[PDB]
Amino acid sequence: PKIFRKKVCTTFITTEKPTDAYGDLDFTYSGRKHSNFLRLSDRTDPATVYSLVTRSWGFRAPNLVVSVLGGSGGPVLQTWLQDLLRRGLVRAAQSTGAWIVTGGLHTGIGRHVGVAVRDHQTASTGSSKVVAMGVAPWGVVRNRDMLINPKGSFPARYRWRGDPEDGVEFPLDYNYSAFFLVDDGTYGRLGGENRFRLRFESYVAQQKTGVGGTGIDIPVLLLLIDGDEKMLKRIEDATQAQLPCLLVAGSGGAADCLVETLEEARDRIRRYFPKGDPEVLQAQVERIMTRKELLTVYSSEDGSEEFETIVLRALVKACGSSEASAYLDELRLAVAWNRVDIAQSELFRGDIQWRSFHLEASLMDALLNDRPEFVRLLISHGLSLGHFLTPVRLAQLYSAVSPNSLIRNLLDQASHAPNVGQVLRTLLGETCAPRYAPWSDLLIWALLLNRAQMAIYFWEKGSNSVASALGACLLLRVMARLESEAEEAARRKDLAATFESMSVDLFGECYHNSEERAARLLLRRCPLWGEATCLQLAMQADARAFFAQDGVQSLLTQKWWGEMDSTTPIWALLLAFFCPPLIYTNLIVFRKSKRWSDFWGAPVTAFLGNVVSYLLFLLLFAHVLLVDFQPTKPSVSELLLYFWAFTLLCEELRQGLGLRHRLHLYLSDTWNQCDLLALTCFLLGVGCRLTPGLFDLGRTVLCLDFMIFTLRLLHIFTVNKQLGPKIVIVSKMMKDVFFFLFFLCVWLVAYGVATEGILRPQDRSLPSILRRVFYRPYLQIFGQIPQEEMDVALMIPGNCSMERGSWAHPEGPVAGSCVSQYANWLVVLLLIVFLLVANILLLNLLIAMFSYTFSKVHGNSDLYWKAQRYSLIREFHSRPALAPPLIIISHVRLLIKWLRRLSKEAERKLLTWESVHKENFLLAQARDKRDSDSERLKRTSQKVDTALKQLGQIREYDRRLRGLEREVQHCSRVLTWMAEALS
Amino acid sequence: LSKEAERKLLTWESVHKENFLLAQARDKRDSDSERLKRTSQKVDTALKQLGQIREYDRRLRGLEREVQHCSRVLTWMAEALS
Amino acid sequence: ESEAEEAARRKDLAATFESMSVDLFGECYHNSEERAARLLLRRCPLWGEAT
Numbered sequence A: 001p002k003i004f005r006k007k008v009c010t011t012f013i014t015t016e017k018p019t020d021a022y023g024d025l026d027f028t029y030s031g032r033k034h035s036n037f038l039r040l041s042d043r044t045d046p047a048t049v050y051s052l053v054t055r056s057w058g059f060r061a062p063n064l065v066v067s068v069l070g071g072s073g074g075p076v077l078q079t080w081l082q083d084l085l086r087r088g089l090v091r092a093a094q095s096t097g098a099w100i101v102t103g104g105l106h107t108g109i110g111r112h113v114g115v116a117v118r119d120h121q122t123a124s125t126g127s128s129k130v131v132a133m134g135v136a137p138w139g140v141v142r143n144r145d146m147l148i149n150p151k152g153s154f155p156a157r158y159r160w161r162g163d164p165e166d167g168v169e170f171p172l173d174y175n176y177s178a179f180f181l182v183d184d185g186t187y188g189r190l191g192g193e194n195r196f197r198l199r200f201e202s203y204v205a206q207q208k209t210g211v212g213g214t215g216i217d218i219p220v221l222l223l224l225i226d227g228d229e230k231m232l233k234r235i236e237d238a239t240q241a242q243l244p245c246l247l248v249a250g251s252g253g254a255a256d257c258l259v260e261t262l263e264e265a266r267d268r269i270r271r272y273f274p275k276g277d278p279e280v281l282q283a284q285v286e287r288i289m290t291r292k293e294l295l296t297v298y299s300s301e302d303g304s305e306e307f308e309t310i311v312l313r314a315l316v317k318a319c320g321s322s323e324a325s326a327y328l329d330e331l332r333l334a335v336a337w338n339r340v341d342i343a344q345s346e347l348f349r350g351d352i353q354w355r356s357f358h359l360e361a362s363l364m365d366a367l368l369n370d371r372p373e374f375v376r377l378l379i380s381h382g383l384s385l386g387h388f389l390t391p392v393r394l395a396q397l398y399s400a401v402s403p404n405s406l407i408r409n410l411l412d413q414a415s416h417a418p419n420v421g422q423v424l425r426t427l428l429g430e431t432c433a434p435r436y437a438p439w440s441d442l443l444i445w446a447l448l449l450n451r452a453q454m455a456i457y458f459w460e461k462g463s464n465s466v467a468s469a470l471g472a473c474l475l476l477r478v479m480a481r482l483e484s485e486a487e488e489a490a491r492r493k494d495l496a497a498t499f500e501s502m503s504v505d506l507f508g509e510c511y512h513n514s515e516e517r518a519a520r521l522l523l524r525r526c527p528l529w530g531e532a533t534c535l536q537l538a539m540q541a542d543a544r545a546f547f548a549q550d551g552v553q554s555l556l557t558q559k560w561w562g563e564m565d566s567t568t569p570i571w572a573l574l575l576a577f578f579c580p581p582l583i584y585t586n587l588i589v590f591r592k593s594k595r596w597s598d599f600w601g602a603p604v605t606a607f608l609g610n611v612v613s614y615l616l617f618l619l620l621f622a623h624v625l626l627v628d629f630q631p632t633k634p635s636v637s638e639l640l641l642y643f644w645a646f647t648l649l650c651e652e653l654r655q656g657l658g659l660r661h662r663l664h665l666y667l668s669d670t671w672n673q674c675d676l677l678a679l680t681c682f683l684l685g686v687g688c689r690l691t692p693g694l695f696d697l698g699r700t701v702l703c704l705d706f707m708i709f710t711l712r713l714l715h716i717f718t719v720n721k722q723l724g725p726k727i728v729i730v731s732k733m734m735k736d737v738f739f740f741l742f743f744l745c746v747w748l749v750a751y752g753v754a755t756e757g758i759l760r761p762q763d764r765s766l767p768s769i770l771r772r773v774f775y776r777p778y779l780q781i782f783g784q785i786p787q788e789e790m791d792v793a794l795m796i797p798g799n800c801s802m803e804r805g806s807w808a809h810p811e812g813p814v815a816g817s818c819v820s821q822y823a824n825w826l827v828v829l830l831l832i833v834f835l836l837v838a839n840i841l842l843l844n845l846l847i848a849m850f851s852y853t854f855s856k857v858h859g860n861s862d863l864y865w866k867a868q869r870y871s872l873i874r875e876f877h878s879r880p881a882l883a884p885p886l887i888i889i890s891h892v893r894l895l896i897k898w899l900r901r902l903s904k905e906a907e908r909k910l911l912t913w914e915s916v917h918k919e920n921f922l923l924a925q926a927r928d929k930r931d932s933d934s935e936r937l938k939r940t941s942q943k944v945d946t947a948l949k950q951l952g953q954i955r956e957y958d959r960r961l962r963g964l965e966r967e968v969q970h971c972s973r974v975l976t977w978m979a980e981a982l983s
Numbered sequence B: 001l002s003k004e005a006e007r008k009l010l011t012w013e014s015v016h017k018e019n020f021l022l023a024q025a026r027d028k029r030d031s032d033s034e035r036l037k038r039t040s041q042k043v044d045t046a047l048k049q050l051g052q053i054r055e056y057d058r059r060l061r062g063l064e065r066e067v068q069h070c071s072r073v074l075t076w077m078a079e080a081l082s
Numbered sequence C: 001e002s003e004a005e006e007a008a009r010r011k012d013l014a015a016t017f018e019s020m021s022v023d024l025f026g027e028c029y030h031n032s033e034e035r036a037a038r039l040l041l042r043r044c045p046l047w048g049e050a051t
């Protein structure tokens, strides 16, 4: 790796040897980031050098390469050209993402370049550096002696700013992110670097823009400043290899070539810019006219962002053969540079009649890279996706996947058995999984690769909107759990909350138009998501804000009542319940063998029959356990009770089976552990009861079992509207209760043992002490205060102890037979302190904590109840429709059944109605963003900047024009004086 | 710790420091009140630009009128030669 | 401190530095947890090797 840099690079002294100087170079006593570094020999292959840059160091690919030449004016350049470098070239390389190849020294042009890059990093916050790459020959290096050690990634403390000597050795500029020190073996001459310089820039011109290539080639430009004769030989050596260029109007050979293109005397123009050797250089002007088309003029039009448009027109003029491929290059490069403001305003004015595949290739370049703005811009020009999404292109869309991503691992596990439908199946299951019309495939594409505005745009253009939004939130939150990195896990949960909010708003407007039609919208199998209803998707995705609306709750009410009227009071339902021939009357409005079946088919009457049958079970269990509980042989009613508990064991077995995973979900719960506990204690009770030696144990265990069967009845009533959410908030108070018991039990030990100690009772059994320490001070909280058990003044004295001291005799069998009188006032004073702390501090601080917790929790408990309420109604729908004394005939029916083994046009009218309300909602939201104050402040700031651009033109251009009219009027008066000379 | 893990730790800290300061700088600059300050400076600049052309063109229009005044009389002096 | 204006000025500038440590350690925690754990529990050699 780091040894590999030596093993490839061999340097010649020609005696060739593998190198040693590969550097994690940085600068002493300065803030620059460490610069990657390698000494390299000439005549080498640029393939492995580019692989060094983009893999071993790791740089992104250029979207543009500009290599700057010059160096005639030595120490100080003109500030007009400094403005051209700083605000023409460096902010262009900041915007497009580009490379600047210059000499990496502090001499010549690289001094002014590094001043320009550092000055631009001052006054710009774009959060990305400007990749400046510098080449320099090994011989002219000042301090190359500190670059020897073959260790690896070493900080070589490179001493800049020291040893000032002129002419011979030059230091390095600290404004470059990489350095390529060309080894010539010459050690002091100017350098034969032009060969590998041209091979490197030609090889970058070979390569393709993009992730896996698949774009146009990286455009390479040259920028010339004044220079020397060797610069002109560098020009013609460059343009022989098809590399375009651009000129300044400073002086020197640049202005020489400008007047050469604005038109013996041409030999004469040669005779004063270098002052030497005219005719060989005249043959190089001949070679200038051999190319004649790779030469552009900058000075005619100057501006801030005019520079990039001049670069594109320098690629239009230097295309060669085809104009159609030239505009194809210009569109795909405007996408590659990620600059809409050029492409919209220069390539879609209507001058060029664009064909279809010219747009489709650019759209593929815009989909493989991440440009939402160009995707919207290219679809807006009348393109059809029915010819676009070839399965070749769709496989190419899943090709550009990051190496350390999640979908890379998931697709490689789908290649174990591309295969996108299996990745959806394994993430989501048999239901809720799509199969494999264009907009649905692009939406699933954008979600699987985690792209934000791509997914929002593809949701806005597609159809079947509400189920696709809830299914989007489902897929995003599943991947958010199955994620490694916290930044991308946070990114998926935020984009999931965006899709949940859009389904809420859309279903809002579809509900405000109609209720019955929106009811047909939700309760429908979406054929893209495995024919799962929208409520099922919002259930699995934990979309709590979707269920917590108003319309969804009213439709859950209508599904609850079923066929009946949803406004039917409870008393009419009960009177219809106990009189089965009162159904066929004018009491309950229906239609919101058939009328009988649509009274008892609702989930309400199944719930009500479940309650009434369960209450009769408790009434029977009490009649057995209180009246007729016989010691030898069970009676009739106890046997009927045994048959009932057998049926409850069967229906629990039907929801336990209804296979290790089902029982793992069955044991993970709490109220199925409760209902399991009631039947373990039941069989323990009966199993002890029929044995002859354990009658009392069986009767006691049955009496403890009745409480568990009674506490089940709180969980049954959580489906009700009025009593529902309050039963939810009961369990969230137990942390305050457990604090109360901690503070109580500490203080109850302290008061108890101190009062039991100051008194000295004579009856000293162990359980009598435990009663007088823990049980009696517990009842003093609830107003049970025995004064006669613990105060001598309410007692009679007596000689009740054969011991020294005073003794007295209290009232009560368990109060101790004889108690002490010494220091009794401290016992009375402990009784006052105990009633103060317990009955005032602890109880009233508990009321304050229940008030605080209740107002803190009440919002989330209402949201959580409204989310779970669908599951409660649905599980009352999938029940045997008989009572628990009559369910066994349906369990046997289920057992012998085990032993034998909308329209289309209403759907189309529904989905068009949905899409209309979608389009009105998006138009309303767009007007609400645009007409705000901050957006209006942005538009006004653009307008004032436009007016500043307009005033600047008339300030200078009228000054020349006023001079021009003054230039005529100056001689017109003298000619009038020459007419007066004729007078 | 070691020494080199300490160096890698402190460079990692300083990277997240620089991203945080760049984010806070963009969040101040792109607010509404700062944009109102920049626009107020731009309008004051345009008031400086309009003030120059108001008076300087008035002299220049007088100067072209100064030539055209005698150019017609010299044309009349040419008409005096006619 | 003796003067109430400069005592108020020091407490305000102290609250500015407390807020900047909160925000910076926020982002260093949202990248990694184990690496930020190695960030806190370390002797700073400029402040007397106090954690």
Ligand SMILES: Nc1ncnc2c1ncn2[C@@H]1O[C@H](COP(=O)(O)OP(=O)(O)OP(=O)(O)O)[C@@H](O)[C@H]1O
Binding pocket: A106, A114, A160, A161, A164, A171, A172, A173, A174, A175
């Ligand atoms: N090695 C270097 N590479 C790039 N730029 C440098 C280098 N040294 C100094 N500069 C820049 O040049 C400017 C100073 O110019 P110069 O280097 O000619 O004089 P100097 O070295 O500061 O003078 P002295 O030798 O007295 O310190 C500084 O602002 C600095 O930013």
